[PDB]
Short mmCIF file of N, CA, C and O and ligand atoms in Angstrom, two decimals:
data_model
loop_
_atom_site.label_atom_id
_atom_site.label_comp_id
_atom_site.label_asym_id
_atom_site.label_seq_id
_atom_site.Cartn_x
_atom_site.Cartn_y
_atom_site.Cartn_z
N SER A 1 -29.98 -58.52 -142.64
CA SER A 1 -29.36 -57.47 -142.20
C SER A 1 -28.04 -57.83 -140.49
O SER A 1 -29.06 -59.26 -140.46
N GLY A 2 -27.81 -57.08 -140.23
CA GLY A 2 -27.05 -58.23 -138.90
C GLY A 2 -25.75 -57.08 -138.66
O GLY A 2 -25.46 -56.87 -139.61
N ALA A 3 -25.55 -56.40 -137.40
CA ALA A 3 -23.83 -55.93 -137.37
C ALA A 3 -23.49 -57.02 -135.77
O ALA A 3 -24.52 -57.18 -134.64
N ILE A 4 -22.75 -56.37 -135.30
CA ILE A 4 -21.74 -57.16 -134.88
C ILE A 4 -21.44 -55.26 -133.60
O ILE A 4 -20.81 -54.61 -134.63
N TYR A 5 -22.03 -55.46 -132.21
CA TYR A 5 -21.33 -53.79 -131.90
C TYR A 5 -20.75 -53.99 -130.23
O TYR A 5 -21.51 -54.86 -129.85
N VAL A 6 -19.13 -54.29 -131.14
CA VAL A 6 -18.03 -54.19 -129.99
C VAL A 6 -17.65 -52.14 -129.52
O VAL A 6 -16.94 -52.29 -130.62
N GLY A 7 -17.49 -52.18 -128.70
CA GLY A 7 -16.53 -51.20 -128.09
C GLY A 7 -17.63 -50.26 -129.09
O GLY A 7 -18.62 -50.40 -128.96
N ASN A 8 -16.46 -48.48 -129.27
CA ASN A 8 -17.59 -48.20 -130.18
C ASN A 8 -17.09 -48.32 -132.00
O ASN A 8 -16.78 -47.35 -133.00
N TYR A 9 -17.31 -50.09 -132.17
CA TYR A 9 -17.12 -50.45 -133.91
C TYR A 9 -18.65 -50.87 -133.75
O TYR A 9 -18.89 -52.10 -132.86
N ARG A 10 -19.08 -51.27 -135.09
CA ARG A 10 -19.96 -51.51 -135.49
C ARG A 10 -19.51 -51.94 -136.86
O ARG A 10 -18.71 -51.72 -137.93
N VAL A 11 -20.22 -53.55 -136.80
CA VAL A 11 -19.33 -54.64 -137.75
C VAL A 11 -20.67 -55.36 -138.66
O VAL A 11 -21.69 -55.96 -138.47
N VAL A 12 -20.54 -54.34 -139.95
CA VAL A 12 -21.05 -55.60 -140.80
C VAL A 12 -20.76 -55.85 -142.57
O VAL A 12 -19.64 -56.20 -142.69
N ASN A 13 -22.01 -56.71 -143.21
CA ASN A 13 -21.77 -56.93 -143.76
C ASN A 13 -20.53 -55.69 -145.14
O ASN A 13 -21.96 -54.84 -145.21
N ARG A 14 -20.21 -56.01 -145.70
CA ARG A 14 -19.43 -54.54 -147.04
C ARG A 14 -20.20 -54.07 -147.64
O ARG A 14 -21.39 -53.51 -147.84
N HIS A 15 -21.18 -55.05 -148.49
CA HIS A 15 -22.16 -54.83 -149.38
C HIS A 15 -23.44 -54.99 -148.72
O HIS A 15 -24.21 -53.99 -149.26
N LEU A 16 -23.68 -54.49 -147.65
CA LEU A 16 -25.09 -54.00 -146.56
C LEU A 16 -23.99 -53.10 -146.04
O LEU A 16 -25.27 -51.94 -144.80
N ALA A 17 -23.32 -52.23 -145.87
CA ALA A 17 -23.24 -51.48 -145.00
C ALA A 17 -23.46 -50.06 -145.69
O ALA A 17 -24.04 -49.57 -147.41
N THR A 18 -23.92 -49.06 -144.72
CA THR A 18 -24.48 -47.45 -145.60
C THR A 18 -23.77 -46.67 -145.00
O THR A 18 -22.71 -46.38 -145.00
N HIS A 19 -24.54 -45.24 -145.96
CA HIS A 19 -23.51 -44.22 -145.95
C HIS A 19 -22.94 -43.28 -145.59
O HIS A 19 -22.00 -43.18 -144.65
N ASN A 20 -24.04 -43.80 -143.88
CA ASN A 20 -23.61 -42.89 -142.18
C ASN A 20 -22.26 -44.43 -141.65
O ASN A 20 -20.87 -43.71 -141.28
N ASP A 21 -22.08 -45.87 -142.65
CA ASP A 21 -20.81 -46.31 -142.32
C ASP A 21 -19.62 -45.65 -143.01
O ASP A 21 -18.67 -45.82 -142.18
N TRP A 22 -20.22 -46.19 -144.31
CA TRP A 22 -19.03 -44.93 -144.75
C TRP A 22 -18.35 -43.97 -144.57
O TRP A 22 -16.93 -43.56 -144.98
N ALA A 23 -19.05 -42.61 -144.32
CA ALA A 23 -19.27 -41.45 -143.58
C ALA A 23 -18.29 -41.95 -142.34
O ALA A 23 -17.67 -40.89 -142.11
N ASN A 24 -18.54 -42.95 -141.41
CA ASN A 24 -17.51 -43.19 -140.15
C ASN A 24 -16.76 -44.27 -140.14
O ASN A 24 -16.43 -45.40 -139.27
N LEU A 25 -15.80 -44.23 -141.43
CA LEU A 25 -15.41 -45.68 -141.51
C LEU A 25 -13.61 -45.92 -140.61
O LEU A 25 -12.65 -45.10 -140.68
N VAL A 26 -13.49 -47.05 -140.67
CA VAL A 26 -11.91 -47.11 -139.52
C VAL A 26 -11.45 -48.94 -140.81
O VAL A 26 -10.73 -48.24 -140.31
N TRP A 27 -12.50 -49.20 -141.16
CA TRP A 27 -11.78 -50.16 -141.92
C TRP A 27 -12.67 -51.02 -142.49
O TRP A 27 -14.07 -51.35 -142.46
N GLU A 28 -11.99 -51.38 -143.84
CA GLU A 28 -13.06 -52.08 -144.40
C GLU A 28 -12.03 -52.67 -146.31
O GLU A 28 -11.04 -53.04 -145.90
N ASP A 29 -13.24 -54.47 -146.21
CA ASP A 29 -12.00 -55.08 -147.21
C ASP A 29 -12.92 -55.89 -147.95
O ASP A 29 -13.29 -56.44 -147.42
N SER A 30 -13.34 -56.05 -148.57
CA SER A 30 -14.28 -56.59 -150.45
C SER A 30 -13.80 -58.14 -150.05
O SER A 30 -14.44 -58.57 -150.45
N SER A 31 -12.72 -58.23 -150.23
CA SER A 31 -12.46 -60.14 -150.85
C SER A 31 -12.69 -60.29 -148.91
O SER A 31 -12.78 -61.87 -149.05
N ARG A 32 -12.73 -59.73 -148.21
CA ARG A 32 -13.91 -60.32 -146.30
C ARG A 32 -15.13 -60.33 -146.07
O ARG A 32 -15.93 -60.63 -145.75
N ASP A 33 -16.13 -59.18 -147.12
CA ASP A 33 -16.96 -58.66 -147.13
C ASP A 33 -17.01 -58.14 -145.56
O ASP A 33 -18.02 -58.10 -145.42
N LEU A 34 -15.85 -57.31 -145.46
CA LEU A 34 -17.02 -57.05 -144.07
C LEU A 34 -15.80 -54.77 -143.87
O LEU A 34 -15.05 -54.60 -144.44
N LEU A 35 -17.01 -54.78 -143.29
CA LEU A 35 -16.96 -53.35 -142.90
C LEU A 35 -16.84 -53.11 -141.54
O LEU A 35 -18.19 -53.57 -140.73
N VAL A 36 -16.02 -52.36 -141.74
CA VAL A 36 -16.12 -51.44 -139.83
C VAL A 36 -16.17 -49.79 -139.84
O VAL A 36 -15.96 -49.70 -140.32
N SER A 37 -17.39 -49.21 -138.97
CA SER A 37 -17.04 -48.78 -138.72
C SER A 37 -17.09 -47.53 -137.58
O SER A 37 -17.12 -48.54 -136.30
N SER A 38 -17.16 -46.45 -136.93
CA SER A 38 -17.01 -46.05 -135.39
C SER A 38 -18.71 -45.58 -134.86
O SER A 38 -19.78 -45.35 -135.97
N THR A 39 -18.50 -46.22 -133.66
CA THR A 39 -19.98 -45.95 -133.39
C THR A 39 -20.19 -44.05 -132.06
O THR A 39 -18.87 -44.78 -131.41
N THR A 40 -20.47 -44.39 -131.32
CA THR A 40 -21.08 -42.95 -130.35
C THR A 40 -21.43 -43.94 -128.73
O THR A 40 -20.72 -43.63 -128.02
N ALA A 41 -22.44 -45.01 -128.70
CA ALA A 41 -22.50 -45.69 -128.56
C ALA A 41 -21.85 -46.70 -128.19
O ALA A 41 -21.10 -47.62 -128.99
N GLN A 42 -21.14 -47.25 -126.45
CA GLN A 42 -20.77 -48.69 -126.52
C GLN A 42 -21.13 -49.32 -127.13
O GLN A 42 -23.10 -49.68 -126.25
N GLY A 43 -21.02 -50.75 -127.63
CA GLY A 43 -21.27 -51.97 -128.09
C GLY A 43 -20.79 -52.85 -127.03
O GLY A 43 -20.51 -53.61 -125.61
N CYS A 44 -22.59 -54.32 -126.35
CA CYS A 44 -22.08 -55.34 -125.46
C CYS A 44 -21.69 -56.33 -126.17
O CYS A 44 -21.57 -57.78 -125.21
N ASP A 45 -21.43 -57.00 -127.84
CA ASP A 45 -20.73 -57.95 -127.76
C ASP A 45 -19.83 -58.30 -127.56
O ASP A 45 -18.48 -57.34 -127.34
N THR A 46 -19.21 -58.68 -127.98
CA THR A 46 -18.11 -59.81 -126.96
C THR A 46 -16.91 -61.16 -127.53
O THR A 46 -18.38 -61.28 -128.75
N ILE A 47 -16.48 -60.89 -128.79
CA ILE A 47 -15.16 -61.48 -129.60
C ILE A 47 -14.53 -62.29 -128.83
O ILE A 47 -13.84 -62.57 -128.04
N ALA A 48 -14.93 -64.06 -129.72
CA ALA A 48 -14.15 -64.55 -129.41
C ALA A 48 -13.10 -65.18 -130.41
O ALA A 48 -12.42 -64.23 -131.36
N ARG A 49 -11.95 -65.03 -129.17
CA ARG A 49 -10.03 -65.93 -129.81
C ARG A 49 -10.03 -66.70 -129.06
O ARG A 49 -9.36 -67.37 -128.02
N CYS A 50 -9.31 -67.96 -130.46
CA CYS A 50 -10.00 -69.48 -130.44
C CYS A 50 -9.52 -69.87 -131.23
O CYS A 50 -10.18 -69.54 -132.82
N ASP A 51 -9.65 -71.23 -132.01
CA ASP A 51 -10.45 -72.14 -132.97
C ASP A 51 -11.17 -73.39 -132.79
O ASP A 51 -11.64 -73.52 -133.77
N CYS A 52 -12.50 -72.79 -131.97
CA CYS A 52 -13.91 -73.64 -132.27
C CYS A 52 -14.16 -73.77 -133.73
O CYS A 52 -14.02 -72.90 -134.52
N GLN A 53 -14.74 -75.06 -133.95
CA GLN A 53 -14.96 -75.02 -134.97
C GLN A 53 -16.85 -75.63 -134.72
O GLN A 53 -17.01 -76.04 -135.82
N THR A 54 -18.14 -75.51 -133.56
CA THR A 54 -18.91 -75.49 -133.32
C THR A 54 -19.69 -74.59 -132.81
O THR A 54 -18.21 -73.23 -132.05
N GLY A 55 -20.13 -74.50 -133.39
CA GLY A 55 -21.59 -72.64 -132.45
C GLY A 55 -22.83 -72.37 -132.65
O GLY A 55 -23.10 -74.24 -133.28
N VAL A 56 -23.08 -71.96 -132.95
CA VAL A 56 -24.88 -71.51 -133.06
C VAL A 56 -25.15 -70.04 -133.99
O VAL A 56 -24.15 -68.72 -133.38
N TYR A 57 -25.85 -70.20 -135.26
CA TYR A 57 -25.96 -68.91 -135.73
C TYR A 57 -27.64 -68.19 -135.70
O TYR A 57 -28.17 -69.15 -135.23
N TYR A 58 -27.64 -67.31 -136.13
CA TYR A 58 -28.50 -67.26 -136.10
C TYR A 58 -29.68 -66.62 -137.58
O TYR A 58 -28.25 -65.97 -138.17
N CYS A 59 -30.76 -67.50 -137.48
CA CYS A 59 -30.96 -67.43 -139.27
C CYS A 59 -32.65 -65.89 -139.38
O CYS A 59 -33.40 -66.88 -139.13
N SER A 60 -31.93 -65.09 -140.12
CA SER A 60 -33.57 -64.85 -140.43
C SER A 60 -34.63 -65.37 -140.65
O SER A 60 -35.84 -64.70 -139.94
N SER A 61 -34.87 -65.39 -141.90
CA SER A 61 -35.48 -66.53 -142.55
C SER A 61 -36.20 -67.46 -142.18
O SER A 61 -36.74 -68.64 -142.80
N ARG A 62 -35.45 -67.66 -140.95
CA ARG A 62 -36.07 -68.94 -139.89
C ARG A 62 -36.29 -68.55 -138.36
O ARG A 62 -36.95 -69.97 -137.76
N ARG A 63 -36.33 -67.06 -138.68
CA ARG A 63 -35.99 -67.29 -136.66
C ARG A 63 -35.76 -67.89 -135.58
O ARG A 63 -36.62 -67.76 -134.66
N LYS A 64 -34.87 -68.33 -136.05
CA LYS A 64 -34.48 -69.43 -135.03
C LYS A 64 -33.08 -69.32 -135.22
O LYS A 64 -32.30 -68.67 -136.20
N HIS A 65 -32.06 -69.70 -134.14
CA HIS A 65 -30.93 -69.93 -134.21
C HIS A 65 -30.61 -71.63 -134.20
O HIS A 65 -31.11 -72.22 -133.59
N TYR A 66 -29.45 -72.08 -134.54
CA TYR A 66 -29.04 -73.74 -134.97
C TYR A 66 -27.74 -73.37 -134.47
O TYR A 66 -26.66 -73.09 -134.85
N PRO A 67 -27.43 -74.48 -134.38
CA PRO A 67 -26.13 -75.36 -133.46
C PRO A 67 -25.49 -75.88 -135.35
O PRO A 67 -26.24 -75.92 -136.35
N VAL A 68 -24.42 -75.47 -135.17
CA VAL A 68 -23.37 -75.64 -136.35
C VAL A 68 -22.62 -76.56 -136.68
O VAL A 68 -21.40 -75.54 -135.17
N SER A 69 -22.01 -76.88 -137.26
CA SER A 69 -19.42 -77.85 -137.01
C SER A 69 -19.43 -76.17 -138.17
O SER A 69 -20.53 -76.51 -139.52
N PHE A 70 -18.66 -75.98 -138.87
CA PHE A 70 -17.95 -74.96 -139.49
C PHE A 70 -16.73 -75.14 -139.36
O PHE A 70 -16.03 -75.75 -138.67
N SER A 71 -16.15 -75.43 -141.05
CA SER A 71 -14.56 -75.40 -141.54
C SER A 71 -14.22 -74.23 -140.59
O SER A 71 -14.41 -72.71 -140.81
N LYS A 72 -12.53 -74.39 -141.03
CA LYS A 72 -11.26 -72.87 -140.38
C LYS A 72 -11.76 -72.25 -142.46
O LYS A 72 -11.60 -71.96 -143.03
N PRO A 73 -10.83 -70.80 -141.23
CA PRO A 73 -11.52 -69.66 -142.02
C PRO A 73 -10.42 -69.84 -142.86
O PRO A 73 -9.82 -70.20 -143.43
N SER A 74 -10.83 -70.16 -144.98
CA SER A 74 -10.63 -69.91 -146.29
C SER A 74 -10.44 -69.31 -146.96
O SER A 74 -11.30 -68.75 -146.47
N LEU A 75 -10.31 -69.64 -148.39
CA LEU A 75 -10.35 -68.89 -149.43
C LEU A 75 -10.73 -70.06 -150.26
O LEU A 75 -10.52 -70.85 -150.40
N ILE A 76 -12.56 -69.49 -150.10
CA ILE A 76 -13.18 -70.02 -150.98
C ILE A 76 -14.45 -69.40 -152.10
O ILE A 76 -13.51 -68.28 -152.53
N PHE A 77 -14.11 -69.98 -153.48
CA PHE A 77 -15.21 -69.97 -153.99
C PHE A 77 -16.08 -69.23 -154.15
O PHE A 77 -16.99 -70.60 -153.63
N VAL A 78 -17.30 -68.66 -154.24
CA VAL A 78 -18.12 -68.01 -153.86
C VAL A 78 -19.08 -67.67 -155.28
O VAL A 78 -18.02 -66.43 -155.97
N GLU A 79 -20.00 -68.74 -156.05
CA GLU A 79 -20.82 -67.75 -157.60
C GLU A 79 -21.43 -66.50 -157.23
O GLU A 79 -21.69 -65.77 -155.70
N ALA A 80 -21.72 -66.03 -158.41
CA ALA A 80 -22.48 -64.70 -158.69
C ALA A 80 -23.89 -63.78 -157.81
O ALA A 80 -23.90 -65.51 -157.61
N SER A 81 -23.49 -63.28 -157.26
CA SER A 81 -25.17 -62.34 -156.27
C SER A 81 -25.51 -61.77 -157.04
O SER A 81 -24.18 -60.39 -157.61
N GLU A 82 -25.40 -60.45 -156.56
CA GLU A 82 -26.16 -59.53 -157.02
C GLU A 82 -24.93 -58.85 -155.99
O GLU A 82 -25.09 -57.00 -156.99
N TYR A 83 -24.57 -58.13 -155.35
CA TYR A 83 -23.50 -57.88 -154.54
C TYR A 83 -21.62 -57.85 -155.14
O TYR A 83 -20.93 -57.55 -155.15
N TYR A 84 -21.18 -59.22 -155.48
CA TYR A 84 -20.06 -59.98 -156.10
C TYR A 84 -20.54 -60.56 -157.29
O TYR A 84 -21.31 -61.79 -157.11
N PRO A 85 -18.87 -60.19 -158.31
CA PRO A 85 -19.49 -61.52 -159.15
C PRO A 85 -18.54 -62.69 -158.45
O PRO A 85 -18.33 -62.17 -157.58
N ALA A 86 -18.78 -64.04 -159.42
CA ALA A 86 -17.69 -64.73 -159.42
C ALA A 86 -16.24 -64.86 -158.48
O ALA A 86 -16.36 -65.04 -159.08
N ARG A 87 -15.98 -65.45 -157.18
CA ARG A 87 -15.10 -65.12 -156.57
C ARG A 87 -14.27 -65.77 -155.87
O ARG A 87 -14.94 -66.41 -154.95
N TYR A 88 -13.09 -65.76 -155.44
CA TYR A 88 -12.88 -66.43 -153.69
C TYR A 88 -12.74 -64.97 -153.04
O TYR A 88 -12.00 -64.32 -153.44
N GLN A 89 -13.88 -65.75 -151.90
CA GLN A 89 -13.52 -65.07 -150.90
C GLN A 89 -12.94 -65.04 -149.75
O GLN A 89 -13.18 -66.90 -149.69
N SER A 90 -11.70 -64.74 -149.59
CA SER A 90 -11.08 -64.86 -147.57
C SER A 90 -11.95 -64.75 -146.27
O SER A 90 -12.97 -64.61 -146.36
N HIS A 91 -10.56 -65.94 -145.64
CA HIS A 91 -11.44 -65.71 -144.11
C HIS A 91 -12.79 -66.23 -144.37
O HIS A 91 -13.72 -65.54 -143.17
N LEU A 92 -13.23 -67.37 -144.42
CA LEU A 92 -14.34 -67.56 -144.91
C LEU A 92 -14.61 -69.05 -144.22
O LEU A 92 -13.71 -69.76 -144.65
N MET A 93 -16.09 -69.07 -143.71
CA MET A 93 -15.85 -70.52 -142.35
C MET A 93 -16.98 -70.82 -143.22
O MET A 93 -18.81 -70.50 -143.58
N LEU A 94 -17.55 -73.01 -143.84
CA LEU A 94 -18.81 -72.83 -144.61
C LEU A 94 -19.34 -74.52 -143.27
O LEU A 94 -19.18 -74.46 -142.34
N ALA A 95 -20.68 -73.73 -143.65
CA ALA A 95 -21.63 -75.08 -142.40
C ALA A 95 -22.36 -75.95 -143.46
O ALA A 95 -23.23 -74.61 -144.65
N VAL A 96 -23.32 -76.72 -142.54
CA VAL A 96 -24.42 -77.25 -143.55
C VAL A 96 -25.48 -76.28 -142.96
O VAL A 96 -25.96 -76.28 -141.19
N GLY A 97 -26.31 -75.80 -143.54
CA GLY A 97 -27.59 -74.16 -142.76
C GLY A 97 -28.76 -73.57 -143.79
O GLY A 97 -27.87 -73.70 -144.90
N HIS A 98 -29.29 -73.36 -143.32
CA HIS A 98 -30.43 -72.12 -144.04
C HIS A 98 -30.62 -71.05 -144.24
O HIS A 98 -29.42 -70.95 -143.09
N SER A 99 -29.85 -70.80 -145.49
CA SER A 99 -29.38 -69.31 -145.95
C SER A 99 -30.46 -68.23 -146.63
O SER A 99 -30.27 -69.41 -147.50
N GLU A 100 -30.45 -67.80 -146.93
CA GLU A 100 -31.10 -66.59 -148.00
C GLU A 100 -30.29 -65.52 -148.12
O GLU A 100 -29.46 -65.41 -146.42
N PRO A 101 -30.51 -64.35 -148.66
CA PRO A 101 -29.43 -63.16 -149.47
C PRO A 101 -30.14 -62.46 -148.00
O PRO A 101 -28.69 -61.24 -146.98
N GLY A 102 -31.51 -61.89 -147.25
CA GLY A 102 -31.29 -61.29 -145.80
C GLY A 102 -30.66 -61.76 -144.59
O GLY A 102 -30.88 -60.89 -143.50
N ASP A 103 -30.49 -63.28 -144.96
CA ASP A 103 -29.85 -63.41 -143.53
C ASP A 103 -28.22 -63.22 -143.14
O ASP A 103 -27.70 -63.21 -142.45
N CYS A 104 -28.47 -62.51 -143.80
CA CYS A 104 -26.21 -61.36 -144.10
C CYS A 104 -26.52 -60.85 -142.68
O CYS A 104 -28.06 -60.22 -143.09
N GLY A 105 -25.61 -60.74 -142.37
CA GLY A 105 -25.48 -59.84 -141.01
C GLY A 105 -25.76 -60.64 -139.43
O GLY A 105 -25.78 -60.11 -138.51
N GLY A 106 -26.49 -61.88 -139.79
CA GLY A 106 -26.80 -62.99 -138.42
C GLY A 106 -25.18 -63.06 -136.98
O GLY A 106 -24.48 -63.61 -139.34
N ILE A 107 -25.81 -63.30 -135.69
CA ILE A 107 -24.36 -63.92 -135.22
C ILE A 107 -24.49 -64.81 -135.56
O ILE A 107 -24.93 -65.79 -135.08
N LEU A 108 -22.86 -65.02 -135.46
CA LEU A 108 -22.74 -67.13 -134.80
C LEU A 108 -21.53 -66.76 -133.96
O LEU A 108 -20.92 -66.08 -133.84
N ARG A 109 -21.63 -67.84 -133.28
CA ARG A 109 -21.22 -68.04 -131.69
C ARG A 109 -20.38 -68.98 -130.71
O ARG A 109 -20.97 -69.72 -131.91
N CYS A 110 -19.80 -68.63 -130.54
CA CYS A 110 -18.69 -69.83 -129.94
C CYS A 110 -19.27 -69.03 -128.25
O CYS A 110 -20.50 -69.18 -127.68
N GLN A 111 -18.69 -70.53 -127.23
CA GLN A 111 -18.58 -70.53 -125.65
C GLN A 111 -17.85 -69.01 -125.46
O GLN A 111 -18.32 -68.39 -124.77
N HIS A 112 -16.86 -68.63 -126.41
CA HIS A 112 -16.17 -67.65 -126.29
C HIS A 112 -16.71 -66.02 -126.76
O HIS A 112 -15.92 -65.84 -125.82
N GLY A 113 -18.13 -66.43 -127.43
CA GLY A 113 -17.91 -65.58 -127.97
C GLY A 113 -18.41 -65.19 -129.39
O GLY A 113 -18.59 -66.30 -129.90
N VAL A 114 -18.51 -64.25 -129.87
CA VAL A 114 -18.76 -63.63 -131.63
C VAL A 114 -17.86 -64.14 -132.38
O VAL A 114 -16.26 -63.56 -131.62
N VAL A 115 -18.16 -64.69 -133.24
CA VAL A 115 -17.19 -65.84 -134.38
C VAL A 115 -17.27 -64.78 -135.79
O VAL A 115 -15.64 -64.45 -136.06
N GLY A 116 -18.51 -64.57 -135.86
CA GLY A 116 -18.67 -64.33 -137.83
C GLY A 116 -19.67 -63.17 -137.98
O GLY A 116 -20.82 -64.09 -136.25
N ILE A 117 -19.86 -63.74 -138.72
CA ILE A 117 -21.58 -62.93 -139.20
C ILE A 117 -21.76 -63.51 -140.52
O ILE A 117 -21.01 -63.95 -141.50
N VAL A 118 -23.29 -64.03 -140.36
CA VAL A 118 -23.49 -64.40 -142.27
C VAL A 118 -23.10 -63.38 -143.06
O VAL A 118 -23.29 -62.68 -143.55
N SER A 119 -22.52 -64.70 -144.48
CA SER A 119 -21.94 -63.59 -145.30
C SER A 119 -22.42 -63.98 -146.75
O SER A 119 -22.53 -63.41 -147.57
N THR A 120 -22.54 -65.65 -146.75
CA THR A 120 -23.34 -66.08 -148.40
C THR A 120 -23.70 -67.49 -147.94
O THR A 120 -24.07 -68.28 -147.25
N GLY A 121 -24.35 -67.81 -148.44
CA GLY A 121 -25.79 -69.20 -148.93
C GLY A 121 -25.68 -69.83 -150.23
O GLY A 121 -25.21 -69.05 -151.30
N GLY A 122 -26.60 -70.22 -150.03
CA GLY A 122 -27.22 -71.22 -151.30
C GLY A 122 -27.04 -72.05 -150.84
O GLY A 122 -26.36 -73.56 -150.62
N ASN A 123 -27.99 -73.68 -151.43
CA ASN A 123 -26.88 -75.10 -152.09
C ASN A 123 -27.45 -75.67 -150.78
O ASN A 123 -26.33 -77.33 -150.64
N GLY A 124 -28.36 -75.47 -149.43
CA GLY A 124 -28.43 -75.84 -148.30
C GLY A 124 -26.97 -75.55 -147.25
O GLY A 124 -26.81 -76.57 -146.38
N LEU A 125 -26.24 -74.70 -147.85
CA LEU A 125 -24.99 -74.22 -147.12
C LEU A 125 -24.99 -73.12 -146.61
O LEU A 125 -25.68 -71.59 -147.49
N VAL A 126 -24.15 -72.57 -145.32
CA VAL A 126 -24.33 -71.78 -144.92
C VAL A 126 -21.97 -70.38 -144.90
O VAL A 126 -21.71 -71.58 -144.27
N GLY A 127 -21.78 -69.66 -145.17
CA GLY A 127 -21.15 -69.25 -144.89
C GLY A 127 -20.46 -67.83 -144.44
O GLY A 127 -21.48 -67.57 -143.75
N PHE A 128 -20.06 -67.65 -143.54
CA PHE A 128 -19.84 -67.13 -142.64
C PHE A 128 -18.16 -65.99 -142.48
O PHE A 128 -16.95 -66.66 -142.08
N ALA A 129 -18.44 -65.27 -142.40
CA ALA A 129 -16.78 -64.21 -142.78
C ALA A 129 -16.42 -63.87 -141.08
O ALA A 129 -17.34 -63.13 -140.27
N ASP A 130 -15.42 -64.61 -141.34
CA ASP A 130 -14.77 -64.62 -139.77
C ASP A 130 -14.28 -63.25 -139.33
O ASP A 130 -13.48 -62.54 -139.83
N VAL A 131 -14.56 -62.97 -137.92
CA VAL A 131 -13.34 -62.01 -137.19
C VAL A 131 -12.90 -62.09 -136.44
O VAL A 131 -12.38 -61.52 -136.03
N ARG A 132 -12.29 -63.38 -135.88
CA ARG A 132 -11.62 -63.36 -134.76
C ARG A 132 -9.90 -63.36 -134.42
O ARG A 132 -9.29 -62.93 -133.83
N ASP A 133 -9.66 -63.06 -136.11
CA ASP A 133 -8.18 -62.34 -136.35
C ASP A 133 -8.40 -61.05 -135.96
O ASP A 133 -6.98 -60.66 -135.71
N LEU A 134 -9.09 -60.35 -136.00
CA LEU A 134 -9.17 -58.62 -135.91
C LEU A 134 -9.02 -58.37 -134.36
O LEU A 134 -9.87 -58.74 -133.82
N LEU A 135 -7.65 -58.35 -134.49
CA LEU A 135 -7.33 -58.04 -132.82
C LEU A 135 -7.83 -56.64 -132.14
O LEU A 135 -8.19 -56.59 -130.50
N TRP A 136 -7.36 -56.16 -133.07
CA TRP A 136 -7.86 -54.59 -132.55
C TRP A 136 -9.25 -53.99 -132.29
O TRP A 136 -9.38 -53.63 -132.01
N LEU A 137 -10.56 -54.99 -132.30
CA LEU A 137 -11.11 -55.19 -132.29
C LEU A 137 -11.54 -54.49 -131.02
O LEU A 137 -12.46 -53.69 -130.39
N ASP A 138 -10.79 -55.18 -130.07
CA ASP A 138 -10.54 -55.25 -128.79
C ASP A 138 -10.22 -54.24 -128.18
O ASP A 138 -10.27 -53.87 -126.79
N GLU A 139 -9.82 -53.15 -128.55
CA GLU A 139 -9.21 -52.24 -128.43
C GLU A 139 -9.32 -50.72 -128.97
O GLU A 139 -10.07 -50.16 -129.50
N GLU A 140 -8.69 -49.44 -128.90
CA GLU A 140 -8.56 -48.03 -128.96
C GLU A 140 -9.76 -47.40 -130.37
O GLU A 140 -10.28 -47.53 -130.87
C1 LIG B 201 -27.90 -65.50 -147.60
S1 LIG B 201 -25.82 -65.51 -148.73
C2 LIG B 201 -27.12 -65.97 -150.25
C3 LIG B 201 -28.52 -67.01 -150.59
C4 LIG B 201 -28.88 -67.86 -150.69
C5 LIG B 201 -28.07 -67.89 -151.91
C6 LIG B 201 -27.40 -66.74 -152.28
C7 LIG B 201 -26.98 -65.90 -151.10
C8 LIG B 201 -25.82 -64.79 -151.59
C9 LIG B 201 -24.68 -64.95 -151.37
O1 LIG B 201 -23.83 -65.77 -151.37
N1 LIG B 201 -23.38 -63.86 -151.95
C10 LIG B 201 -24.79 -62.42 -151.96
C11 LIG B 201 -23.78 -61.86 -151.32
C12 LIG B 201 -22.16 -61.35 -150.75
C13 LIG B 201 -22.12 -62.86 -150.93
C14 LIG B 201 -20.81 -62.55 -150.68
F1 LIG B 201 -20.08 -62.56 -151.54
F2 LIG B 201 -19.93 -62.22 -149.73
C15 LIG B 201 -22.29 -63.59 -151.48
ZN1 ZN B 202 -14.71 -70.74 -129.38
#
C-alpha cells in the first residue's frame, strides 16, 4: 500500500483505490495502473520534473529503502495478477529489486522529488508507474 500526497491530490495504484477515492475522483488510467483523488488536507510530497534513471524506492516487504537504476517509462508486457490479466502497461519503468503485491504504492524518488510508485513485481524485478509527465499535479 501507499500513496503520493501532492497539493490537494492523492495518487494511488488504481487497483488499490478505495470507495472514497472513486467518490472523489480526479483522473484514472487502467493502462498505467494510476488513480488520483482529491483531498481536504494539503500534502507534502513534491513531484520530480526530470529524466533521472537512478533513485531510491521503499520496499514494505523488507522495511527498507533501496537505491536502484531504472529504465525510461515504456510500454511493457506484464504477466497476469489478481488485479489485471496479462497485458501491456504503459509509462512503466523497470529495475532489479525485491517486490511482492503488497509493495505496490511504495515511492520511488530521485534528487528532484517523487518519480513514481511501485506497480509491478516478481522474478527479482520491480516496476514503477511514472508520474513525472503529469504536470497538472503541481497546480489547481
Ligand atoms: C509488487 S507487484 C508484484 C510482486 C510480486 C509478484 C507479482 C506482483 C503483482 C504484479 O506485478 N501485478 C499485479 C497487480 C497489478 C500490477 C500491474 F498490472 F499494475 C501487476
Ligand atoms: Zn530526477
